[PDB]
Amino acid sequence: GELEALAKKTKALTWKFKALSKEPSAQELEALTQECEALGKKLKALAQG
Amino acid sequence: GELEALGKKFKALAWKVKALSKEPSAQELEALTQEAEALGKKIKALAQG
Protein backbone atom coordinates (compact mmCIF):
# COMPACT_ATOMS: atom_id res chain seq x y z
CA GLY A 1 0.00 0.00 0.00
CA GLU A 2 0.72 3.72 0.18
CA LEU A 3 3.53 3.51 2.76
CA GLU A 4 5.64 1.13 0.72
CA ALA A 5 4.93 3.12 -2.46
CA LEU A 6 6.18 6.32 -0.77
CA ALA A 7 9.23 4.49 0.70
CA LYS A 8 10.26 3.28 -2.76
CA LYS A 9 9.75 6.78 -4.27
CA THR A 10 11.88 8.20 -1.46
CA LYS A 11 14.65 5.70 -2.18
CA ALA A 12 14.51 6.57 -5.87
CA LEU A 13 14.72 10.27 -5.00
CA THR A 14 17.74 9.84 -2.66
CA TRP A 15 19.58 7.78 -5.27
CA LYS A 16 18.88 10.40 -7.98
CA PHE A 17 20.51 12.96 -5.69
CA LYS A 18 23.41 10.62 -4.99
CA ALA A 19 23.87 9.85 -8.70
CA LEU A 20 24.02 13.48 -9.84
CA SER A 21 26.92 14.48 -12.03
CA LYS A 22 29.23 17.30 -10.93
CA GLU A 23 27.43 19.62 -13.42
CA PRO A 24 23.83 18.33 -13.52
CA SER A 25 21.54 19.31 -16.37
CA ALA A 26 18.68 21.76 -16.03
CA GLN A 27 16.31 18.96 -16.90
CA GLU A 28 17.71 16.60 -14.19
CA LEU A 29 17.20 19.29 -11.60
CA GLU A 30 13.69 20.00 -12.82
CA ALA A 31 12.94 16.26 -12.43
CA LEU A 32 14.35 16.29 -8.89
CA THR A 33 12.29 19.38 -8.07
CA GLN A 34 9.13 17.66 -9.30
CA GLU A 35 9.86 14.39 -7.48
CA CYS A 36 10.39 16.30 -4.17
CA GLU A 37 7.16 18.22 -4.64
CA ALA A 38 5.21 15.06 -5.56
CA LEU A 39 6.41 13.20 -2.50
CA GLY A 40 5.62 16.18 -0.27
CA LYS A 41 2.10 16.43 -1.71
CA LYS A 42 1.52 12.66 -1.33
CA LEU A 43 2.69 12.70 2.31
CA LYS A 44 0.36 15.61 3.12
CA ALA A 45 -2.57 13.85 1.43
CA LEU A 46 -1.93 10.63 3.38
CA ALA A 47 -1.64 12.77 6.56
CA GLN A 48 -5.21 14.01 5.91
CA GLY A 49 -6.32 10.36 5.50
CA GLY B 1 1.78 14.20 12.61
CA GLU B 2 5.07 12.91 11.17
CA LEU B 3 3.49 12.39 7.71
CA GLU B 4 2.44 16.05 7.51
CA ALA B 5 5.77 17.33 8.86
CA LEU B 6 7.82 15.13 6.51
CA GLY B 7 5.61 16.33 3.65
CA LYS B 8 6.35 19.98 4.42
CA LYS B 9 10.04 19.19 4.58
CA PHE B 10 10.00 17.58 1.09
CA LYS B 11 8.23 20.70 -0.26
CA ALA B 12 10.93 22.87 1.37
CA LEU B 13 13.60 20.74 -0.34
CA ALA B 14 11.75 21.11 -3.67
CA TRP B 15 12.13 24.88 -3.38
CA LYS B 16 15.85 24.52 -2.71
CA VAL B 17 16.27 22.46 -5.88
CA LYS B 18 14.05 24.89 -7.79
CA ALA B 19 16.34 27.78 -6.84
CA LEU B 20 19.48 26.04 -8.21
CA SER B 21 20.94 27.69 -11.28
CA LYS B 22 23.57 26.59 -13.80
CA GLU B 23 26.66 24.83 -12.25
CA PRO B 24 25.50 24.59 -8.62
CA SER B 25 28.43 24.20 -6.24
CA ALA B 26 29.42 20.74 -5.03
CA GLN B 27 28.85 21.98 -1.48
CA GLU B 28 25.25 22.86 -2.32
CA LEU B 29 24.52 19.59 -4.19
CA GLU B 30 26.02 17.66 -1.25
CA ALA B 31 23.97 19.70 1.26
CA LEU B 32 20.76 18.94 -0.61
CA THR B 33 21.75 15.27 -1.03
CA GLN B 34 22.31 14.98 2.72
CA GLU B 35 18.91 16.59 3.46
CA ALA B 36 17.27 14.08 1.09
CA GLU B 37 19.13 11.19 2.78
CA ALA B 38 18.07 12.44 6.26
CA LEU B 39 14.43 12.66 5.16
CA GLY B 40 14.90 9.24 3.59
CA LYS B 41 15.97 7.72 6.94
CA LYS B 42 12.78 9.13 8.54
CA ILE B 43 10.53 7.74 5.78
CA LYS B 44 12.20 4.32 5.97
CA ALA B 45 11.53 4.19 9.73
CA LEU B 46 7.92 5.40 9.27
CA ALA B 47 7.12 2.91 6.46
CA GLN B 48 8.64 -0.25 8.01
CA GLY B 49 6.31 -3.21 7.29
Residue numbers in the entry:
A (entry chain C), B (entry chain D): 1 to 49
From the publication, what sentences describe this entry?
Here, we describe the design, characterization, and application of de novo helical hairpins that heterodimerize to form 4-helix bundles in cells. Starting from a rationally designed homodimer, we construct a library of helical hairpins and identify complementary pairs using bimolecular fluorescence complementation in E. coli. We characterize some of the pairs using biophysics and X-ray crystallography to confirm heterodimeric 4-helix bundles. Finally, we demonstrate the function of an exemplar pair in regulating transcription in both E. coli and mammalian cells.
